[PDB]
Amino acid sequence: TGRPEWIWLALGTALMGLGTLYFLVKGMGVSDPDAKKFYAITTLVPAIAFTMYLSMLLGYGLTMVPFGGEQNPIYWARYADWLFTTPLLLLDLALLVDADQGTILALVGAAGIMIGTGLVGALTKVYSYRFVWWAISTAAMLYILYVLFFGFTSKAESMRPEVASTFKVLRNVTVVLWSAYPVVWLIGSEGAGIVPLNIETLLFMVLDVSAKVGFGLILLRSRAIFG
Numbered sequence: 318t319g320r321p322e323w324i325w326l327a328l329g330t331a332l333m334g335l336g337t338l339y340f341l342v343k344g345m346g347v348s349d350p351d352a353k354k355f356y357a358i359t360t361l362v363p364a365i366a367f368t369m370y371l372s373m374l375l376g377y378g379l380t381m382v383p384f385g386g387e388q389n390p391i392y393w394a395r396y397a398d399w400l401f402t403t404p405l406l407l408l409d410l411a412l413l414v415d416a417d418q419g420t421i422l423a424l425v426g427a428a429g430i431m432i433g434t435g436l437v438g439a440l441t442k443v444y445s446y447r448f449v450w451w452a453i454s455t456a457a458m459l460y461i462l463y464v465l466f467f468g469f470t471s472k473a474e475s476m477r478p479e480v481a482s483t484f485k486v487l488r489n490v491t492v493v494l495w496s497a498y499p500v501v502w503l504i505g506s507e508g509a510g511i512v513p514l515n516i517e518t519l520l521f522m523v524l525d526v527s528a529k530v531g532f533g534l535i536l537l538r539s540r541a542i543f544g
């Protein structure tokens with residue numbers, strides 16, 4: 318096939334793969350129980366992303382949805398990735414500030430809606446309805462970010478400054494990266510179709526790699542992960 322976005326798919330596969338192995342090797346050396354906990358969640362994140370970037374690289378996770386008078390290329394393998402990677406990143410942040418079980422359940426549920434309605438939207442054939450679903454997904458995301466900024470940050474204050482300060486960074490990198498996804502979807506292939514797929518794939522890999530491997534490096538190199 319040789320689609321124009323494959324080079325970006327091959328770069329995301331490489332970065333995710335390398336990041337997985339570094340975390341894995343660093344994780345099986347640590348003896349601390351809590352550290353092990355964080356290491357196992359943070360290594361699984363880029364491991365799932367790697368398998369999906371690799372599948373997309375190989376021609377899977379791609380479907381042609383009809384709307385706007387075109388046969389539009391929608392990479393659904395992405396939501397198969399995010400359906401398990403977003404709630405896992407939320408768990409890393411939840412365990413860090415000692416969030417409650419109700420909070421975690423509500424954040425994971427919200428994340429499920431966000432990705433579910435997102436895909437339903439990327440698959441919808443009525444152009445205007447694609448944006449109705451997009452709208453609900455975004456509203457779910459704003460709920461998650463609100464909790465992370467108002468809820469979590471507040472409970473991270475019962476932690477030590479080292480733990481509170483690591484959370485602020487992970488919390489900030491998350492608020493900045495996550496807010497970007499809905500905009501890329503809106504002006505990209507799933508939405509307006511203003512930004513071409515090849516460029517769109519490049520934006521997503523920079524966001525995906527930063528949000529997982531970038532997030533993992535910051536978190537796993539900190540002492541806040543220790544029991």
Ligand SMILES: *C/C=C(C)/C=C/C=C(C)/C=C/C1=C(C)CCCC1(C)C
Binds near residue numbers: 399402498528
């Ligand atoms: C490793 C992947 C990460 C951290 C992905 C985060 C993805 C989002 C915050 C995605 C959000 C979306 C919306 C708000 C609405 C439209 C569709 C999505 C799923 C692209």
